[PDB]
Amino acid sequence: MVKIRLARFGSKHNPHYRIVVTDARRKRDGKYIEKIGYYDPRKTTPDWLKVDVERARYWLSVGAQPTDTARRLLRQAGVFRQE
Amino acid sequence: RNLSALKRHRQSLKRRLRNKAKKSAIKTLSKKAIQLAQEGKAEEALKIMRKAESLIDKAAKGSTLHKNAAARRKSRLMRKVRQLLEAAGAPLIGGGLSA
Amino acid sequence: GRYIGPVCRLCRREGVKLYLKGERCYSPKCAMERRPYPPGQHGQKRARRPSDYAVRLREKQKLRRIYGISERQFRNLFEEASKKKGVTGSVFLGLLESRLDNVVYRLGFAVSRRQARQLVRHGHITVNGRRVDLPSYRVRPGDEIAVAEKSRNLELIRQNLEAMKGRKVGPWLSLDVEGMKGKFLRLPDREDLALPVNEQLVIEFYSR
Amino acid sequence: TKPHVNVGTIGHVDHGKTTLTAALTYVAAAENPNVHVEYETAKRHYSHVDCPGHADYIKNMITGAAQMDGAILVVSAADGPMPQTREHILLARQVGVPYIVVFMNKVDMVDDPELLDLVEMEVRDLLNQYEFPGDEVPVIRGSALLALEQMHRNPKTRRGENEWVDKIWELLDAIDEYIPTPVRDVDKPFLMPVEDVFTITGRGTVATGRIERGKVKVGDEVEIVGLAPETRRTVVTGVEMHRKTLQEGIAGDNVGVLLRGVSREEVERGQVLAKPGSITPHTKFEASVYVLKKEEGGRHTGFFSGYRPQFYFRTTDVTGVVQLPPGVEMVMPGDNVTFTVELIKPVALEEGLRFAIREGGRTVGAGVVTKILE
RNA sequence: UGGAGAGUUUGAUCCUGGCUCAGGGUGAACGCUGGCGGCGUGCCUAAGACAUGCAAGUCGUGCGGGCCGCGGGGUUUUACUCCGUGGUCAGCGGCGGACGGGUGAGUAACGCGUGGGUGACCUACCCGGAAGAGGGGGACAACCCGGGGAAACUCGGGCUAAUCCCCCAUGUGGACCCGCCCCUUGGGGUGUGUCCAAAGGGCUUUGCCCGCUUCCGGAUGGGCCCGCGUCCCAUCAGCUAGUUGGUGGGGUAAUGGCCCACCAAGGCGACGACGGGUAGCCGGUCUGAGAGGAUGGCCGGCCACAGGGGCACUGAGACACGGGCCCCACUCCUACGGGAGGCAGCAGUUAGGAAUCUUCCGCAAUGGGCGCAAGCCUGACGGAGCGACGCCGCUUGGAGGAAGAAGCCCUUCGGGGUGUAAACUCCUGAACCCGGGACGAAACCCCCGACGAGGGGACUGACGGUACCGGGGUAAUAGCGCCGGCCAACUCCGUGCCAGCAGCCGCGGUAAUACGGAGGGCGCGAGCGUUACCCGGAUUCACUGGGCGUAAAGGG
RNA sequence: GCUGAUAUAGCUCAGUUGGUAGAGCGCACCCUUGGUGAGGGUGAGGUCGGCAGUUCGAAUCUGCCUAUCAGCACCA
């Protein structure tokens, strides 16, 4: 189905995954749909994660499956939180 | 030597037949249908077309003929049929077809 | 690698007195003071009107050979100095000044260019906090270059750091002589840099 | 487990050295589970090199002598003393090979009082004639041919149930005993001359030859120094002795060495695989030689500087220019000298390495590298 | 924000003009020499053939037994072995092998590119919503017994359970013949008739949990279709019979000649048809001031192929990389009666060749499959190794230090160069030795709270004991090309149109700056030269930007 | 790695019949030129592929070995 995984951008040993929507069968770093946010593992730069909430939700309201750790980067991104 | 995918082959020769029959039934049905719907078997003609519709749709119920696959064959059975029950017929037993 | 070898031979050749050895290249014998001529066997006979080429060659070499930058970097760094919005004259020159090691030398610490380079290749140097060993590290505004500690008590760091008392630094650099700091207040200027170089020629040397 | 020793046979053609070899194995399979050939007594492990035992092939037979701790002079009952024998016997001293166990085969042939013991006379008399244990040699009796057919009937037979079957142990007992096991200093680097060269599915170039010093295993860097181009550094990825994997294969075991990612050209005979830095190519070198006198079989005339015989280093056979140092001229036979060699082919030398100097189907001299000129 | 030129036709000049140098690019190769790291990158030929290993599996929460070990002996003991419960071996049944991965052979093509049409259509799993899930019969495996057999296997009969299979109702609903309505290529609504639904699995059991049936809306990915663009040869000029259209059928998810009958004779073409060559296409790539030119390999997108050729089954999906049926070529076993095999997946052999990698470590991350989950499979992947192939970073030392060693070479014999170069003196300290030692990894999961939000906790690292930090600490690799001019760089000797150089003009015929060595010098530096090939300079196919009275060229 | 064949002046290639190794094309110093050609002059040399043994006598019979050409030598 249509999931919300990551793409390995960045050199060797230097990851910089990109949070995105894509028809599961694609290849990881393969063409995807629309971008939603990024992620930097070594947490270098206090600017290592954003996620277009507004957009992040649309894709779910229509059925989007995140990864297990993609679920998480969203949890850190407070996406389900509704008060 | 081998892989457990043959599992997927035997598991085929089976269904491979299961629907083959259901198929050839609708054929031997349809023939034997119009075969009488044009002769003037109004009653015992639709009888078959009403039997067909049944055997056809149920085929739909499976991996055999699906969606339009039968929705197609119908609009030709009852199509062709009636276009024969006009060689001086009048749908006596108004079974399947409708006035 | 960065040449390494007779360098008061180029004090000659380019015939425009050079001091890559510092102290001596600065004495009554920069080698240059005894031979205002190229080396070799001939070295002192009539010269053919150096080709329009020639000129530009001496001009580059003159500069490139005045730092230690081996072509590859220099010409490379030159390119970077092109796209950069602005005159290639300044920029590049400035860009050549941005060299960590040079700067060191520019700011006492070491007697000559060729020396400042070892200082970086051993640890002795340090910038806004953490230390650096890349002669290539390029310096940015408001960044002060500091001598390390393990070195501060070194015989050499001494005398060398002493040559400051009195002399003042380049109008784009400061200096806490006792606390060996001094910052990089801004990319120097054509005029500040009184170099025996006609940039506009060295430039022309690379269109062809 | 059981100590190992590379051995072989020798002698005159048709005597049966080739077939005795057949018997030796087989038999050794009955009372020994899991069984150039390989067999193993109930006391030792073994490597055997049936030699071609024939002129012409000598050149690769001598390389076979260099590769053994003991020779098995085979001899026929109906025959006895023989030309190819006298030959493949003096070459037994030249190329090391300590001790010799004669096996009068064909034993089962024409009865005679003398003959049986009259043959041991044409033997023992011809053995000391070449300064060997010509008097105390393990002379066994019991045609192997005949025993090699008794084991063919039923592939299982213990301690001599068919006379000759046990007469095959007269060897399988006389050789275990008598012929000890020497040292192979593993504390040294690595090294081992190249005998032939093979190719394989997935593996490729394998080297056959005896290890001289140290040991190798998968994951070792080595140098292939032996004529042509320049030394070739490569890693060993395969160490298997006698068709089966050998773990560390030390000195005294001829295993096949698989040199990673190479071709079968770059790895020809007469080379040497040693420690990265062990041995190097050298074309000129000093060496104290021993011109073999005329009474010893060699040169019956001598020579003069400029001569150019053929030297055999380890498993090689090359041609070099002899440049006698000023004053060194007509250096006749039975004379020791000291001149230099200039092989027309760069070769693996290590100063203080033994070699010989032949010429024309006979041995002409014995030398040992002194220093290397180039 | 961007354009540079020269060497060569002469006795000399100017013109046209061909050639050639200075520039930049490279999956390269060959030569000589070769210390380090990181990031890149690594058959361009044989779409040749491949001894081995590994690439796709996963569910007991669909079902029934085989089986090894433990709960309690039916009765009273072994008996009709009933049942509690976790491993495990296939079988049944499910979702998955149609993606990931590899290659470019084929192909000039609606194949690709791009903008659109689909009132001519499909889509598993994925979320939203509407209605439901009541009853029923049965087979074949597994297993037991009998057989052929070298084996791969397989034949007979007999039980057997399911989410496997078939029949009834159930008709919210959808599919069809026909009639009406609004709409206009089959879309939307409406009435009669006919026709089809369906499975229970889990524990903490009138309630959750993953499912089932049909319907609809959303998403995602697809098929078909269309205008436009898409290389050379015209010494290739005409091409076509399912060919062009119609009509009614078959087939399709769907349009259509896609297929078939029937008729009519059309359709295409110098705006280049038909044929021949070549070639996967683009995003992009190198060059160029630009316009152009040349190109399509790392990575992504679409397509095509999976030993060669054909084909169908299964399914939402393939006419199927590692599945099947057949023919062929070829390899292997063979009890010579019939089997087996496709690395253009990973690692590697060999063949050819100028030439291109390790039979690897790990699933920790990321990603994909199956499941409630645990977690399992994953040669995709993340790392490592080899290769100066490339780029970028780094060292072989830094500061002193002579009217100036020695040696080697010119020398108007006065003396000039190598040269501060070395030596020597300090100093620093690549390496090597010592200890500490990473992030990438926080979640599936557990706990409060409803497996919600939110809050709390824990396990998990292949590269690694590497990177980086702290301590100690030895001066510790250099090579290639060139020096008449174009072009930076001069002299001695040997050589005597010889030996030889040469990109172009050209040097060598007893003083050679050009051949060869030497001393010296110039560029560059782990590189440097050579070869090959693209663009440039070349307004030297010219739009930008040329020419045609004798230079090339007006047609008689 | 075993044999077989070919290895004769710089080059082509003659031959012998065991014994003071040929032909021409070239070529070296001349006279000449500037140098060469041509013209008239003068000739001067073959390790019989190589190292080695046999003979009174070794390019011809022996033994070895080296570049090269041809062969179901050649999977630990």
Ligand SMILES: C/C=C\C=C\[C@@H]1O[C@](O)([C@H](CC)C(=O)NC/C=C/C=C(\C)[C@@H](OC)[C@@H](C)[C@@H]2O[C@H](/C=C/C=C/C=C(\C)C(=O)c3c(O)cc[nH]c3=O)[C@H](O)[C@@H]2O)[C@H](O)[C@H](O)C1(C)C
């Ligand atoms: C010979 C081939 C290869 C040698 C290789 C190397 O040799 C070696 O370098 C070796 C080291 C010493 C070496 O140099 N060998 C090199 C030399 C070594 C020589 C050593 C020992 C001697 O001593 C003087 C030794 C044999 C000595 O001789 C005597 C024999 C005399 C015979 C006379 C002939 C007679 C009657 C006869 O009928 C006869 C004949 O035989 C042949 C032909 N026709 C005949 O008519 C006696 O028997 C003594 O024992 C090492 O062994 C290396 O490792 C190696 C094996 C690689």
Ligand SMILES: Nc1nc2c(ncn2[C@@H]2O[C@H](COP(=O)(O)OP(=O)(O)O)[C@@H](O)[C@H]2O)c(=O)[nH]1
């Ligand atoms: N009389 C007899 N003849 C035998 C025996 N062994 C071998 N042979 C024969 O001797 C001849 C040569 O045998 P082989 O083994 O080939 O000897 P090689 O020449 O040393 O290889 C052949 O005919 C053999 O069959 C034996 O024990 N006795």
Ligand SMILES: [Mg+2]
């Ligand atoms: Mg074998």
Ligand SMILES: [Zn+2]
């Ligand atoms: Zn100076």
